[PDB]
Amino acid sequence: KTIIINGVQFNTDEDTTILKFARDNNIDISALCFLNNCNNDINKCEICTVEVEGTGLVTACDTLIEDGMIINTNSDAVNEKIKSRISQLLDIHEFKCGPCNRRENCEFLKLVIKYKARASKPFLPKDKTEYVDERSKSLTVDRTKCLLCGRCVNACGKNTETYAMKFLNKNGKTIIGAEDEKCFDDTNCLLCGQCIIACPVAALSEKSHMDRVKNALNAPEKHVIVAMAPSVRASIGELFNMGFGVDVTGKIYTALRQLGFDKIFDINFGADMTIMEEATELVQRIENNGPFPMFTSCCPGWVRQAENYYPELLNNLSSAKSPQQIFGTASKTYYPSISGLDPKNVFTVTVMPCTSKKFEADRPQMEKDGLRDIDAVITTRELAKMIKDAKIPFAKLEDSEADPAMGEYSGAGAIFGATGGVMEAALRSAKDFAENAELEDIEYKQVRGLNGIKEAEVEINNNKYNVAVINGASNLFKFMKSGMINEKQYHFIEVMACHGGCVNGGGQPHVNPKDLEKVDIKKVRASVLYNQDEHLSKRKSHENTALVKMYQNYFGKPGEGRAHEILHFKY
Numbered sequence: 036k037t038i039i040i041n042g043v044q045f046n047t048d049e050d051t052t053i054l055k056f057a058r059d060n061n062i063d064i065s066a067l068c069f070l071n072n073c074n075n076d077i078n079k080c081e082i083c084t085v086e087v088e089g090t091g092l093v094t095a096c097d098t099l100i101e102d103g104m105i106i107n108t109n110s111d112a113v114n115e116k117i118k119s120r121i122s123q124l125l126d127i128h129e130f131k132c133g134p135c136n137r138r139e140n141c142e143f144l145k146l147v148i149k150y151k152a153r154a155s156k157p158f159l160p161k162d163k164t165e166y167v168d169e170r171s172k173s174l175t176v177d178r179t180k181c182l183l184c185g186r187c188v189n190a191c192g193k194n195t196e197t198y199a200m201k202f203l204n205k206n207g208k209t210i211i212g213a214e215d216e217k218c219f220d221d222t223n224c225l226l227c228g229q230c231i232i233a234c235p236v237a238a239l240s241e242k243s244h245m246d247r248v249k250n251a252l253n254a255p256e257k258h259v260i261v262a263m264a265p266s267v268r269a270s271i272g273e274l275f276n277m278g279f280g281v282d283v284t285g286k287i288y289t290a291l292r293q294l295g296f297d298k299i300f301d302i303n304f305g306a307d308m309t310i311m312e313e314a315t316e317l318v319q320r321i322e323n324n325g326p327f328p329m330f331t332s333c334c335p336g337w338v339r340q341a342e343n344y345y346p347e348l349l350n351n352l353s354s355a356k357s358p359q360q361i362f363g364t365a366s367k368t369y370y371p372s373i374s375g376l377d378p379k380n381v382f383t384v385t386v387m388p389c390t391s392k393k394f395e396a397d398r399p400q401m402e403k404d405g406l407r408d409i410d411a412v413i414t415t416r417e418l419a420k421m422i423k424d425a426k427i428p429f430a431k432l433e434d435s436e437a438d439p440a441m442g443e444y445s446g447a448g449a450i451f452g453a454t455g456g457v458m459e460a461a462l463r464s465a466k467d468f469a470e471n472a473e474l475e476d477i478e479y480k481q482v483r484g485l486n487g488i489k490e491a492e493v494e495i496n497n498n499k500y501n502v503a504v505i506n507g508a509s510n511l512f513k514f515m516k517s518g519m520i521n522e523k524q525y526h527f528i529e530v531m532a533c534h535g536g537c538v539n540g541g542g543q544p545h546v547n548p549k550d551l552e553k554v555d556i557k558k559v560r561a562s563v564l565y566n567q568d569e570h571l572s573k574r575k576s577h578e579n580t581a582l583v584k585m586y587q588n589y590f591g592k593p594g595e596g597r598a599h600e601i602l603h604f605k606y
């Protein structure tokens with residue numbers, strides 16, 4: 036093929052779109068509704084318009100290059116069209132960036148600036164009740180910002196295959212929303228937030244827990260614990276212009292102190308707890324030659340997928356609480372026992388890459404004696420915003436350490452944030468428990484990385500066992516619907532709702548589609564976790580010295596008795 040673009044000749048055998056070809060050859064073409072290799076097929080944004088001689092204006096993002104094409108990306112006709120489309124969007128957009136939670140990284144604002152576009156008639160709604168939906172424990176919709184670009188609908192379809200996010204017709208007006216305009220929680224929605232990550236604007240957001248947290252921090256009698264997820268320390272630096280793949284563990288700890296939190300713990304300690312419990316459960320099932328498979332139960336997106344689509348699997352879930360809830364339960368029981376705090380005054384906050392964690396933390400039965408396991412959950416984004424509002428100079432902060440009693444973690448806990456992390460961590464402990472040894476080969480590289488469905492055969496004490504790692508909620512559906520689950524007896528299966536694992540959660544920093552072209556965000560975020568695992572002296576959960584003291588002195592034997600009554604949960 037011979038293609039001419041902006042007067043430049045290319046000879047190529049590529050079968051691809053004008054947009055992709057252009058960007059591979061450093062020619063600028065704007066795009067808005069194109070993401071995840073699809074665009075909005077029914078009301079195309081046309082922001083990727085280019086001129087093809089002999090044809091006229093075409094959308095670059097979904098038009099294949101053809102021998103003979105002469106393309107202009109920057110003619111007057113092209114810029115007037117794009118500008119016009121942006122102006123029409125401004126007519127349905129409450130353009131007030133000051134207070135807007137996307138002010139610093141909005142794709143639309145950038146386009147508005149780029150083409151110097153203006154509304155024909157400013158949109159200034161007087162009743163946002165109509166436009167805002169805050170019923171969900173995890174997601175919020177603000178339709179005054181919604182461009183009807185369809186990226187959330189497409190992202191939900193590709194990432195989950197639930198299509199819980201849909202276009203809806205509301206008396207002649209098109210909106211997005213859940214089935215029948217219900218609260219998302221009341222539908223098959225997983226509450227994973229992949230739709231938020233796909234949104235170019237402030238139209239979708241996490242349900243804020245920031246007021247919960249600030250009220251608690253300012254309440255004199257509340258002792259506010261905070262603990263962050265594995266993924267936050269690999270991610271939050273992005274939002275302070277530190278670049279990608281930066282380990283900021285120590286800066287976070289210092290930042291949390293400066294925000295006024297009273298105790299700095301770490302959910303990776305909770306991850307080591309989950310393993311203590313679940314690896315023990317796996318050995319029990321192995322000893323009792325059943326029941327199989329056991330599924331992980333740490334990802335609440337997957338738990339909702341099971342509840343909504345495979346309720347017959349709920350009995351197969353490990354009864355170990357997730358790192359978050361297990362940690363939270365311990366923070367109301369063990370931690371008062373070693374600190375003297377009145378348990379009612381402990382307020383336990385997590386920092387999560389995840390929107391679905393807010394739903395999990397607010398589950399009615401996730402409490403004991405009237406005390407919630409977890410009182411508040413803020414996303415990575417929310418924490419970033421709290422830090423910025425407090426004017427903490429995050430990139431400049433010095434490293435500090437977590438408080439050790441519920442803050443130490445092993446390398447096994449550290450890699451939880453990546454797909455295959457839980458599997459690898461659990462196998463490190465299950466192999467030791469079952470064989471009563473302290474094995475040296477602990478790296479299970481076969482369960483790592485971005486393949487959608489990953490499997491491995493593992494030897495545990497003279498028998499072969501089959502494990503699987505399902506990476507993405509859409510891959511759960513594939514694994515089940517294709518009957519892959521029936522090709523062999525599976526013994527232990529990890530499921531994560533977000534492809535890449537939690538490092539790609541719905542609570543994570545947005546990344547500009549351009550940067551996504553440069554960086555594999557899933558791999559670069561995960562790399563921080565695996566690097567920690569490599570450089571930690573303890574790389575097995577049951578080697579965590581703080582955790583071991585906690586079990587010796589308070590919980591007893593994992594997976595039975597007290598530990599089973601307190602730290603487990605069945606759906």
Ligand code: SF4
Pocket residue numbers: 128129130131132135136137138139141142143144180236237238
């Ligand atoms: S979504 Fe973007 S353009 Fe719209 S008000 Fe917020 S920052 Fe401004």
Ligand code: SF4
Pocket residue numbers: 180181182183184185186187188211233234235236238239
């Ligand atoms: S909520 Fe966001 S991604 Fe979904 S259609 Fe509106 S602007 Fe696009």
Ligand code: SF4
Pocket residue numbers: 174190191192194195197198199200219223224225226227228229230231
């Ligand atoms: S939270 Fe997940 S399942 Fe629900 S609409 Fe968004 S992408 Fe779909």
Ligand code: SF4
Pocket residue numbers: 226227333334335336337388389390391392531532533536537538539540541
């Ligand atoms: S994979 Fe992690 S971030 Fe995604 S829904 Fe599950 S727990 Fe949340």
Ligand code: FES
Pocket residue numbers: 065066067068069074075079080081082083084094095096097
């Ligand atoms: S980016 Fe091509 S039609 Fe929207």
Ligand SMILES: [Mg+2]
Pocket residue numbers: 073074075076097
């Ligand atoms: Mg298309």
Ligand SMILES: [Mg+2]
Pocket residue numbers: 251252253254255257259295
């Ligand atoms: Mg306080």
Ligand SMILES: [Mg+2]
Pocket residue numbers: 316353354355594599603
């Ligand atoms: Mg059990």
